[PDB]
Amino acid sequence: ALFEPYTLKDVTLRNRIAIPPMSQYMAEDGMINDWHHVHLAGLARGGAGLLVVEATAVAPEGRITPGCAGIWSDAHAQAFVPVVQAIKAAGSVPGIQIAHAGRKASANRPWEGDDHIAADDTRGWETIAPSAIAFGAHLPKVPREMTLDDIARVKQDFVDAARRARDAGFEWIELHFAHGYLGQSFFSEHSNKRTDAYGGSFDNRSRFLLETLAAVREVWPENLPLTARFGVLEYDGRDEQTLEESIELARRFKAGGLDLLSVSVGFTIPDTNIPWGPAFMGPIAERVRREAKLPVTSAWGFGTPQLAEAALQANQLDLVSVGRAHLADPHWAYFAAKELGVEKASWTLPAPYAHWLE
Amino acid sequence: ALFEPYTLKDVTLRNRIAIPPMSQYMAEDGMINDWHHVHLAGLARGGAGLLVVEATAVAPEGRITPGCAGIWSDAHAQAFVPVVQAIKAAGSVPGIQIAHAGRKASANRPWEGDDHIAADDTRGWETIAPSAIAFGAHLPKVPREMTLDDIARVKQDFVDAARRARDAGFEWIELHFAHGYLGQSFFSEHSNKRTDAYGGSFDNRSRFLLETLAAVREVWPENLPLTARFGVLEYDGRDEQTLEESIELARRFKAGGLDLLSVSVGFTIPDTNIPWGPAFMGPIAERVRREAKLPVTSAWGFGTPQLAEAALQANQLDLVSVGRAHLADPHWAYFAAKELGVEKASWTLPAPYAHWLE
Numbered sequence: 001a002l003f004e005p006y007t008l009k010d011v012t013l014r015n016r017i018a019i020p021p022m023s024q025y026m027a028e029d030g031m032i033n034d035w036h037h038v039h040l041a042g043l044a045r046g047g048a049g050l051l052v053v054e055a056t057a058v059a060p061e062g063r064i065t066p067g068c069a070g071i072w073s074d075a076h077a078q079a080f081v082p083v084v085q086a087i088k089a090a091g092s093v094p095g096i097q098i099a100h101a102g103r104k105a106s107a108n109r110p111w112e113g114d115d116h117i118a119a120d121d122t123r124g125w126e127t128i129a130p131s132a133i134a135f136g137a138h139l140p141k142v143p144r145e146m147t148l149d150d151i152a153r154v155k156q157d158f159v160d161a162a163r164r165a166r167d168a169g170f171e172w173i174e175l176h177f178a179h180g181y182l183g184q185s186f187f188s189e190h191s192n193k194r195t196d197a198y199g200g201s202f203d204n205r206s207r208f209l210l211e212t213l214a215a216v217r218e219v220w221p222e223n224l225p226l227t228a229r230f231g232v233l234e235y236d237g238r239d240e241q242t243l244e245e246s247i248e249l250a251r252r253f254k255a256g257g258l259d260l261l262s263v264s265v266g267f268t269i270p271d272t273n274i275p276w277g278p279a280f281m282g283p284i285a286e287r288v289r290r291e292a293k294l295p296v297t298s299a300w301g302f303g304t305p306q307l308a309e310a311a312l313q314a315n316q317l318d319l320v321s322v323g324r325a326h327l328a329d330p331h332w333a334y335f336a337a338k339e340l341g342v343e344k345a346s347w348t349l350p351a352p353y354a355h356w357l358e
Numbered sequence: 359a360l361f362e363p364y365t366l367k368d369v370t371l372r373n374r375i376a377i378p379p380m381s382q383y384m385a386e387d388g389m390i391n392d393w394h395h396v397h398l399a400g401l402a403r404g405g406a407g408l409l410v411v412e413a414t415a416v417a418p419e420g421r422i423t424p425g426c427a428g429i430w431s432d433a434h435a436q437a438f439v440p441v442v443q444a445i446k447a448a449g450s451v452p453g454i455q456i457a458h459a460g461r462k463a464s465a466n467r468p469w470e471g472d473d474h475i476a477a478d479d480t481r482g483w484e485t486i487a488p489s490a491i492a493f494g495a496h497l498p499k500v501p502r503e504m505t506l507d508d509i510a511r512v513k514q515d516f517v518d519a520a521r522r523a524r525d526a527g528f529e530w531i532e533l534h535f536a537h538g539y540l541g542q543s544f545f546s547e548h549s550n551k552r553t554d555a556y557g558g559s560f561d562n563r564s565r566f567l568l569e570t571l572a573a574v575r576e577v578w579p580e581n582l583p584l585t586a587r588f589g590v591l592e593y594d595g596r597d598e599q600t601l602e603e604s605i606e607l608a609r610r611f612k613a614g615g616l617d618l619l620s621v622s623v624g625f626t627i628p629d630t631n632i633p634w635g636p637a638f639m640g641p642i643a644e645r646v647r648r649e650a651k652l653p654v655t656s657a658w659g660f661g662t663p664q665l666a667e668a669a670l671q672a673n674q675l676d677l678v679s680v681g682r683a684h685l686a687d688p689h690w691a692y693f694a695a696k697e698l699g700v701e702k703a704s705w706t707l708p709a710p711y712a713h714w715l716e
């Protein structure tokens with residue numbers, strides 16, 4: 001099942017393996033470089049059906065860190081062009097996740113402190129959010145409360161991002177409404193205390209996300225999968241209530257043209273109890289898939305080929321996302337093909353490798 | 359031991375893992391391209407101390423196949439420049455093996471027939487050799503017997519190759535006197551029936567190889583390791599006699615400035631009985647190292663980390679060459695570091711990987 005093709009709109013994946021977006025923190029002023037080119041091209045040659053490029057910021061202040069990729073100008077977009085072309089040459093589908101880190105922005109690289117940049121550090125910048133409330137813990141900076149014009153500008157930033165991604169050749173797009181960044185923070189009552197049209201009720205908290213989806217839909221081709229990542233629960237003790245609302249929004253996403261939902265956890269606040277474990281997201285992903293009638297993917301511990309296979313056969317997922325295993329071994333898909341007994345498994349890789357490994 | 363550094367002349371390897379030259383058959387008219395760039399850059403990031411670029415032909419007719427890399431012009435050399443730079447950025451030592459396929463030239467890619475190109479095929483070309491004798495089997499073409507001027511031209515080709523490799527930034531060079539190609543074929547009485555100064559006696563059969571070494575030594579920097587690959591036996595039933603002569607030449611190589619010998623089998627003729635097995639070359643490599651008092655490396659089945667480690671501790675080898683395992687997993691060195699219990703093994707890889715795998 002893991003090695004069956006998958007067709008969504010006009011795009012066909014050679015198998016059900018997806019490489020989720022994985023920030024590399026190697027960009028400079030949003031510009032990617034040979035780090036990203038070799039990293040992504042190598043992964044694509046590895047065998048995976050779909051390769052989703054890391055969170056790429058729609059605006060400079062939307063970066064998580066000073067090393068995050070960006071696409072907030074045509075020059076930033078043009079940098080992706082050769083990389084998209086190499087992904088394609090390798091037979092993998094190029095996707096990109098476009099993002100805005102909201103209140104979690106302006107942080108150090110994970111191996112350089114992983115915390116909010118000091119106030120006197122010339123690399124830092126003011127963060128924006130639905131409300132002037134800090135995440136807390138290692139991210140103590142209070143964001144600036146967004147104005148209506150801020151909301152209009154960020155929405156237009158996402159549209160400009162999607163248009164650039166389209167013109168750079170990406171065949172799959174993913175809106176980053178998860179992991180406690182801007183979009184997610186608009187939906188959660190934890191982070192959104194607004195009293196205008198973008199806060200309060202379910203409809204108001206959904207507005208930013210729905211409006212961003214719709215605006216992007218106007219520039220993104222109808223024949224290329226339009227997707228989003230969304231934290232459907234927080235493990236904050238409000239799980240049944242949050243899940244119900246998240247699934248309702250899923251339905252609205254579907255109605256608004258979303259082709260697939262990447263299902264995750266919110267990470268909106270630090271005060272939570274997440275039951276980490278191999279494929280722990282499976283049951284939750286399955287429920288979203290069932291109740292909103294929407295294809296889904298998820299991640300976390302599916303680097304065990306049998307687990308990925310089990311999730312597919314149980315129809316908990318339509319694609320299995322495999323992250324860290326690909327950082328460890330860019331040729332993981334070949335390893336999975338061996339594990340699962342695929343005929344001529346070495347031909348998961350290109351000929352200059354496959355010939356000698358068969 | 360596998361993860362101890364190694365210093366040879368002015369060059370220091372971060373560990374004892376070497377990636378042997380592995381032809382990719384993806385070049386066009388000798389020119390390398392993004393296949394090679396991503397392949398080599400990815401391998402370098404994998405952790406290995408030394409990365410030796412595939413057999414690179416000193417002359418067009420010296421290619422094995424129409425897909426082999428070449429360095430017979432300054433434009434060919436300039437193509438290597440960015441790739442050398444990425445290898446270095448990754449902290450691996452860039453080396454290159456320069457070569458001439460002799461009578462085994464003009465062949466199909468291994469996955470496209472692996473045999474001599476048909477006579478009416480516009481891709482093929484006349485092969486040259488010490489004598490007009492075909493390899494046989496799947497390589498039936500009779501080569502043209504080289505003239506003295508042919509020998510002068512090929513020697514100068516190797517010199518021009520070494521100079522280009524130097525100027526492109528390579529820090530390690532390897533002359534390909536193994537595997538039944540030109541150099542090897544000059545040494546073996548099987549392939550060399552000449553009656554001039556380049557055939558007959560031990561001194562005459564050694565002349566081409568020694569003269570090529572000396573000529574290259576004039577352009578190659580004295581502070582960068584100068585090495586060769588040499589088939590020391592054939593398993594043709596003349597093993598003790600061939601090994602003695604090969605070891606004598608090893609001594610002469612050492613006396614002539616060779617810093618390390620990559621020890622292999624001859625593959626000069628097809629009528630042989632090679633005792634393939636995990637690390638089967640170990641004992642033979644050890645003897646060459648001992649009797650010629652020369653550092654050595656070898657390959658074949660050392661993809662088992664414990665085997666590589668054993669060979670080093672037994673002092674059978676100074677570097678362990680690991681080939682196919684790196685085609686399977688470009689991050690093999692990280693896998694070995696885990697297997698062997700290295701402290702902070704994930705930091706065998708660059709930070710954007712290591713941070714998440716620790």
Ligand SMILES: Cc1cc2nc3c(=O)[nH]c(=O)nc-3n(C[C@H](O)[C@H](O)[C@H](O)COP(=O)(O)O)c2cc1C
Pocket residue numbers: 020021022023024054055097176178179229299300301302303321322323324325710714
């Ligand atoms: C290096 C790294 C960077 C990541 N960056 C992002 C990101 O840019 N966008 C995102 O939505 N998730 C990101 N993630 C989460 C992964 O997409 C994935 O959900 C997570 O690694 C769990 O899957 P795994 O167990 O296979 O690693 C990142 C994960 C890692 C390890």
Ligand SMILES: Cc1cc2nc3c(=O)[nH]c(=O)nc-3n(C[C@H](O)[C@H](O)[C@H](O)COP(=O)(O)O)c2cc1C
Pocket residue numbers: 352356378379380381382412413455534536537587657658659660661679680681682683
């Ligand atoms: C894909 C491939 C291409 C190779 N090309 C060369 C070559 O260009 N020059 C050379 O001397 N040996 C070449 N070899 C031999 C390898 O350098 C090495 O000796 C062999 O793979 C045995 O080591 P291993 O068991 O780790 O794979 C090649 C091997 C492979 C698999």
